[PDB]
Amino acid sequence: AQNPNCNIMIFHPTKEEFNDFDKYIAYMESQGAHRAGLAKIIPPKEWKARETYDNISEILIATPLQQVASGRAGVFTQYHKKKKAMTVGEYRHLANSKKYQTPPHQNFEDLERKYWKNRIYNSPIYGADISGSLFDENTKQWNLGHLGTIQDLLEKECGVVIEGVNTPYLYFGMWKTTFAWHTEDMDLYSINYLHLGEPKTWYVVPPEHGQRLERLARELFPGSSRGCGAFLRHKVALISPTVLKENGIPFNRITQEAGEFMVTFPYGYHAGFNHGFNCAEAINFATPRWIDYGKMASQCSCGEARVTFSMDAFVRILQPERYDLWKRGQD
Ligand SMILES: O=C(O)CNC(=O)C(=O)O
Numbered sequence: 001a002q003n004p005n006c007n008i009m010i011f012h013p014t015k016e017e018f019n020d021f022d023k024y025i026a027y028m029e030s031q032g033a034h035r036a037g038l039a040k041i042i043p044p045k046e047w048k049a050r051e052t053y054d055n056i057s058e059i060l061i062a063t064p065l066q067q068v069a070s071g072r073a074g075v076f077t078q079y080h081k082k083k084k085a086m087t088v089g090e091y092r093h094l095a096n097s098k099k100y101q102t103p104p105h106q107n108f109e110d111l112e113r114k115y116w117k118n119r120i121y122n123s124p125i126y127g128a129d130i131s132g133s134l135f136d137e138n139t140k141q142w143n144l145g146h147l148g149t150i151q152d153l154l155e156k157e158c159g160v161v162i163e164g165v166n167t168p169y170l171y172f173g174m175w176k177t178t179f180a181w182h183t184e185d186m187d188l189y190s191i192n193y194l195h196l197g198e199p200k201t202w203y204v205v206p207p208e209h210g211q212r213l214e215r216l217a218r219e220l221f222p223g224s225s226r227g228c229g230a231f232l233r234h235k236v237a238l239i240s241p242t243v244l245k246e247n248g249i250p251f252n253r254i255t256q257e258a259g260e261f262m263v264t265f266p267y268g269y270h271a272g273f274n275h276g277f278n279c280a281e282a283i284n285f286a287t288p289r290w291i292d293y294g295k296m297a298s299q300c301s302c303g304e305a306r307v308t309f310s311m312d313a314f315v316r317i318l319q320p321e322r323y324d325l326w327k328r329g330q331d
């Protein structure tokens, strides 16, 4: 069995290997990359996502989100408070202001320490989930707006044409902006490209051990757990690496830098934080191997999760027994 310890693997495809996305995902899996839940892909040196980032300041962040924490430094939830619209150029200035800028630090490890010690005492503002792309239309390899759609994959595997579209999203971050522990909708893959700026630190639980994280989370967030049997779908809970290690939960960590891709694999729980002002693009995708995960994915039906239009068909076709309850939670 490849990668039996479930370590995060880092890949350096050549330009030739970068031409066929699906083939390279399958290659990574043949080497056991999915067992970690997360992989890094460093593009060939010949590749670029676009020519420059000099002309992005007028992009609008219609609803920046202030991420307010409740709990203790290693075990907390966050809610999102909506803020007034602002442009990327305004957000970038905000991120670099004294209130929000990255502190002095020695290295990624020192900054990690500072994040877990101090995050709860501040409320950073995140421009998340903005539909759009920063890939040049002429970038033909690993362009996250030109991947094969999940609706086409489900049709190719199962024979049923479904409605829905699959487009990318932009994330504009600042120091301490935080992504809570989650798997993807319908336990899909995700791919995330860090276009510019400061790094993103990731934590990940192997898919084979996801239920260990879920059991701990029920213990640590007992009011949330009562409310919903899949409350990690709410995407509000944070647990630090120190607390995970105290509770024997298998996990790994890695820092992504600008110009690097990360892929999250089906049922790979992940969480993390941004080091400073940055912009990432991400999108969900599927492969044949996903289908069995999709059919078994847990679902939130309490109302909290609320998701995209295009999830409906995935539940309806893959999980017909669950669909009526889930749809009620949608409405
Ligand atoms: O970058 C972010 O804030 C969160 N990203 C992801 O969870 C992802 O790409 O799957």
Ligand SMILES: [Mg+2]
Residues within 6 Å of the ligand: 055, 056, 057, 058, 059
């Ligand atoms: Mg612009």
Ligand code: NI
Residues within 6 Å of the ligand: 182, 183, 184, 190, 264, 270
């Ligand atoms: Ni994710």
Ligand SMILES: [Zn+2]
Residues within 6 Å of the ligand: 227, 228, 229, 230, 231, 233, 234, 300, 301, 302, 303, 304, 305
């Ligand atoms: Zn729920």
